Amino acid sequence: GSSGSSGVVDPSKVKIAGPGLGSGVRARVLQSFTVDSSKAGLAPLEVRVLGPRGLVEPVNVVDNGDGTHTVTYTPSQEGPYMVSVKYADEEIPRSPFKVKVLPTYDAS
């Protein structure tokens, strides 16, 4: 049951689950995931994508309305990318995120 009166922000309660963060990512492909911060509080969510060499790519942020956030992006190229995420000026315990992008073409 719901009991207690507190309004603190817990950046350690926010998580993310989606294909965009998985290992099955391909370059020049639509990558998106879900950011659950309902247990974190009412704090904002920040995101950042850093290329393998040190490139800077933009990110999308959309509020679901229930208790999550959708972030769409597209890795111009492949390689060891890095998707950092913050919450209320506090780098979540799950960030940064090591996402190794793969070449649209699979060398079988």
DSSP conformational letter for 79: E
Give the 3-state secondary structure percentages of the chain, helix then strand then coil, rounded to 5.
0, 40, 60
Name all domains of the chain by residue range, CATH numbers in brackets.
7-103 (2.60.40.10)
Token digits for 55? 């490139």
Token digits for 9? 């922000």
Token digits for 87? 């919450």
8 Å CB contact between 35 and 69: yes
CA distances from 71 to 15, 18, 31, 35, 96 (A): 13, 10, 8, 8, 15
8 Å CB contact between 14 and 39: yes
